[PDB]
């Protein structure tokens, strides 16, 4: 038994040596030449009010106009962000929703939480009302995140330390991803949707192959719980947000940390992260009630989206990069531009 | 300046707002109780008296209570305990027959109670503490002493003194005596006690709002 353990230690040492060999340069040095982004000024274009409790998740539709927000008052609300009109108000079977998703086709929304179930809702019914299409049971812990691949495939992360890929038609988990030793808190599909990455409470992020069903890479830079994870638009990198108050940019090909975004007087955790369309801005939500905008290539804050009276729990950028939505525990979403 | 279909959409949005407000008003009248405790503390019997979270809905003397049994969540409690910030009170269950049981087992119960009571999300949330299996405690204490769990204990082996000692040992874990009250109870009497404690909490919150407290 101990021979396996020492072989594992040797493999970790070899991996570290290879990563160090590939660390000849630092992203900061290479980016020192380019001009920094100015003071990124954004103001609340819209304030989406109507939730009567903490908002825990929000997601944009691929049309960049409709968004769904989940709150623990037991409601999913589909908003028309241009007009602030409530397109739908879906009453949930369990009010402890901690995640929500919008199908890329716009036909379905998903949500889950402490019920350990991911419920898919059919928006495009002929009866004119939204009804639950499928209930995805099989996780033993709370549902932390869920993201559609197609109208029929959804991958979910759970607090039981496993991620699962589901066939919505049958309701069975086609694949189960294991290897995290802590609760999986976030999840992010690659732009091609052939790979996805997940952050866990073990302070490590793991890259998975959707079709092969096994972990390709593991990243362990963070010093604490990872609360959020987002894929860089190119699909060759991803950023993580942790309770240790720092973001960290990892690159799949270089297989190691590239940059860490932190400041001395910001000490709270990070509830969500996201990128702008180019990838120059890395917008992160914090428990100190405001979101910070980071110059992804230069590590320095470019702005602050203050204006929430409580923790900024969720954060998203439209597919066309035209706006940013930030939900909060004060029960208001705000569109910033 | 809106078209006909835009005006109809705005009317739909207003109807949705009205229904949301009605739902929120209805929800406000609900008393939300978080049920916690050790695995074998007797939470099941307490629930009876009234794969993830289990919500129990009961009505007692015109108050509709929602009690959420979250014991099935084996995941990390630190990541979702904030969901229950705002519950009227926490019901905590411990078994008075866990001095010599091990998992020590009462020491685990006190550890969990210390974690829950001094959590930053429950600074002002009142706690209703149920001390279960008092009959089994009465039987067991005659044979095994309380010194096994509390070496510093120096009182008699009678049921009353030992029960009081355990009650104060639990209540002294409260580091914020001023802003939080612990309503200890030895387990229809249970439902009546829950109702009384909840009514007291609600009235004290209202008086705080009105400046009378």
């Amino acid at each position: 038994l101990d021979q396996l353990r020492q072989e594992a230690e040797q493999l970790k040492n070899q991996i570290r040596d290879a990563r160090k060999a590939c660390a000849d340069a630092t992203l900061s040095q290479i980016t020192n030449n380019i001009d920094p982004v100015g003071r990124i000024q954004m103001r609340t274009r819209r304030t989406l009010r109507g939730h009567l409790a903490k908002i825990y998740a929000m997601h944009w539709g691929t049309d960049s106009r409709l968004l769904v927000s989940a709150s623990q008052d037991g409601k999913l609300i589909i908003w028309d962000s241009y007009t602030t009109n409530k397109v739908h108000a879906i009453p949930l079977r369990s009010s402890w929703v901690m995640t929500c998703a919008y199908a890329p086709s716009g036909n379905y929304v998903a949500c889950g939480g402490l019920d350990n179930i991911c419920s898919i809702y059919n928006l495009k019914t002929r009866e004119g009302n939204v009804r639950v299409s499928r209930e995805l049971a099989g996780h033993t812990g709370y549902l932390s995140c869920c993201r559609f691949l197609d109208d029929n495939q959804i991958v979910t992360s759970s607090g039981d330390t496993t991620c699962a890929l589901w066939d919505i038609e049958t309701g069975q988990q086609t694949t189960t991803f294991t290897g995290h030793t802590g609760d999986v808190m976030s999840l992010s599909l690659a732009p091609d949707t052939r790979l996805f990455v997940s952050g866990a409470c073990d302070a490590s992020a793991k890259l998975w192959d959707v079709r092969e069903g096994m972990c390709r890479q593991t990243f362990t830079g963070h010093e604490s719980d990872i609360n959020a994870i987002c894929f860089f638009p190119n699909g060759n990198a991803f950023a993580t947000g942790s309770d240790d108050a720092t973001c960290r940019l990892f690159d799949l090909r270089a297989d190691q940390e590239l940059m860490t975004y932190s400041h001395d007087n910001i000490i709270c955790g990070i509830t969500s992260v996201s990128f702008s369309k180019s990838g120059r801005l890395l917008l992160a939500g914090y428990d100190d009630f405001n979101c910070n905008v980071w110059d992804a290539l230069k590590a320095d804050r470019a702005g602050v989206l203050a204006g929430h009276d409580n923790r900024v729990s969720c954060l998203g950028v439209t597919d066309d990069g035209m706006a940013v939505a930030t939900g909060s525990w004060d029960s208001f979403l705000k569109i910033w531009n | 300046t809106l078209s006909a279909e835009d005006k109809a959409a705005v009317e739909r949005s207003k109807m949705i707002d009205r229904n949301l407000r009605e739902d929120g008003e209805k929800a406000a009248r609900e008393v939300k109780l978080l049920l916690l405790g050790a695995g074998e503390s007797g939470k099941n019997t307490i629930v009876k008296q009234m794969t993830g979270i289990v919500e129990t809905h009961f009505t007692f003397k015109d108050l509709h209570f929602k009690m959420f049994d979250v014991g099935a969540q084996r995941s990390e409690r630190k990541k979702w305990i904030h969901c229950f910030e705002g519950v009227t009170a926490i019901i905590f269950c411990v078994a008075l027959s866990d001095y010599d049981l091990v998992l020590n087992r009462m020491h685990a119960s006190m550890k969990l109670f210390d974690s829950i009571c001094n959590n930053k999300w429950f600074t002002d949330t009142s706690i209703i503490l149920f001390l279960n299996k008092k009959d089994l405690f009465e039987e067991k204490i005659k044979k095994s002493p309380l010194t096994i769990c509390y070496p510093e204990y120096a009182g008699s082996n009678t049921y009353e003194e030992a029960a009081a000692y355990i009650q104060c040992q639990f209540e002294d874990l409260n580091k914020r005596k001023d802003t939080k009250e612990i309503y200890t109870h030895f387990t229809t009497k249970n439902v009546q006690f829950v109702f009384d404690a909840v009514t007291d909490v609600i009235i004290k919150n209202n008086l705080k709002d009105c400046g009378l407290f």
Partner: single-chain antibody
Amino acid sequence: VQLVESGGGLVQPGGSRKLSCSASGFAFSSFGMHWVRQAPEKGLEWVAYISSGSGTIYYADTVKGRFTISRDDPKNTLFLQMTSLRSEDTAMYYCVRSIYYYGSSPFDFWGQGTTLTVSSSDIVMTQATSSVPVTPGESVSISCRSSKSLLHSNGNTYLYWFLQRPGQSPQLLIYRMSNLASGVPDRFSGSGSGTAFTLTISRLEAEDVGVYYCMQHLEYPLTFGAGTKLEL
């Protein structure tokens, strides 16, 4: 989804009659309801509208005051009290559901219609071609035109296309001049420039023959075209 109307039959001029439609198979409470009538030898003509929740009601000037539209959401029934009936009111009355939100399809489902017999600033929509000879397998196009431009500042061209086959209620083909309705074959396609619009059918089947009605939803007096007929 079924809308079944009743209350037709002979009525002496100046009398009163109540039309009713029974709604089943859909959330009647969340749909706006329209009444549309069709004279035995004329095209469609909007009559009245009642919004979801009965918060808004509109009538055509020809029936305003005389008629009144009401709905019973718990009973899923829609009513139309017609008083002071006149010979001009002889027509088959349809009940049409319409739900209004971003991306919805108003006028998606029509009822089977009830026949009423009376004993003996509006936008104008023009369908110049009354009839067209057509055979299956070919390609056909139907033109349309309006007095006002139907393109709104929000980017929506509020034009609707309906097909009424012999002995059948109109079926929504296109809504807002480009969006194909659910269940319609892809061979149908709509387009327009804001004031002139066209509907095209490719490799049309033998079941595609009928009268094609154009409708505008930009303003309250909703108005239909004369209708273009395709005959085998």
